[PDB]
Design a protein around this nucleic acid. Structure first.
Lengths: 180, 177
DNA sequence: ATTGTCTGATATTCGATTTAAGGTACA
DNA sequence: ATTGTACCTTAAATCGAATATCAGACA
């Protein structure tokens, strides 16, 4: 249950001190803190060090990933590992009770805004399906060859060898056309 | 206590009705449903803004269907939570009310002000999903050759690319500089 | 016979989803 | 050693927007 902390800036040194000053004042040992500037290298170091159960403190969200997406990415990566993160100024934890409440949500957000880019695409799809464009893989096996052989009384396992397809395929093909 | 719903697309009617049909199955009366499509014609979402009253609640199928981006989306919710208006998303199972309802708005207020603060970082100096064909051509190779005085067509035959590509590769590196 | 410049056609590439076929497991 | 049957994994293929390369035309 080690206590680690992270800060980042783009340029400024001074704001990098205020973060570290806040973090030590949070009972973070000096050797437990990592930083970055404009070179993500220290973050990577942190990715390495952390073991399950360890917890990391950050000033604000904006100091974590380079953007709203990356930020979520990293947290997800850390709760994958059973790590927990706690933000100070905004007062938030990926552990405890809200621990699940928290990451339930940052998931939806990312995946939402992802879905928003594709908004046009995935919609152009719904319309295509409407039109009756066929989806999925294209049928590579002759459904007439198979139905004929089984009409004659030829068996599954043989038809399987004959056409060099799987057997379970042949119980599938018959199921489909005997349904329709 | 009233129940409303909102639905939003770009063009498709079909992906809209999918949302409407799912909002009627969620028990929203037909007149209580508003829509939009892309100009920024937000008319539906505005009309809604007007009609809700404290305690009334709005249903949206998925988060992506509220704002034009992550900001617009959060901006709107705070605005509703300010009125005692609650928003509930079906398919993601999230609400601004009930128990975790506060814990929901509390954090969303963090990212806005987190990313408001990111917008201010970029601004002073100046999509995330990669798309499109990968570069199969080494650029370093084309740069050095033309730098040495190798003509356009000599490089194109050397690396089995088209000449016209040779010029694209040059124009790109030139604007970057 | 090549050189610049430009426009148009091909060719991939994404994410979430939708079907086709392969493969195991069991009675 | 085969037969049904039920699920679980892969394997292509879907849309439109985005990016790269190709293939020529014209001066």
């Amino acid at each position: 249950m080690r206590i680690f902390g992270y800060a980042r800036v783009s340029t400024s040194q001074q704001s990098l001190d205020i973060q570290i000053r806040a973090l030590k004042d949070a009972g973070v040992k000096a050797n437990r803190i990592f930083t970055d500037k404009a070179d993500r290298e220290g973050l990577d170091l942190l990715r390495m060090k952390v073991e399950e159960g360890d917890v990391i403190l950050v000033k604000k969200l904006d100091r974590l990933g380079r953007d709203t997406a990356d930020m979520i990415q990293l947290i997800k990566e850390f709760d994958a590992q059973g790590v927990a993160v706690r933000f100070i100024d905004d007062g938030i934890s990926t552990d405890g009770d809200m621990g699940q409440m928290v990451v339930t949500i940052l998931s939806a957000v990312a995946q939402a805004e992802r879905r928003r880019i594709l908004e046009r695409t995935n919609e152009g799809r719904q319309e295509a399906k409407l039109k009756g464009i066929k989806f999925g893989r294209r049928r590579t096996v002759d459904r007439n060859v198979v139905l004929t052989l089984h009409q004659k009384g030829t068996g599954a396992t043989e038809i399987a060898h004959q056409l060099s397809i799987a057997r379970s395929t042949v119980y599938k093909i018959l199921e489909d056309e005997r349904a329709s």
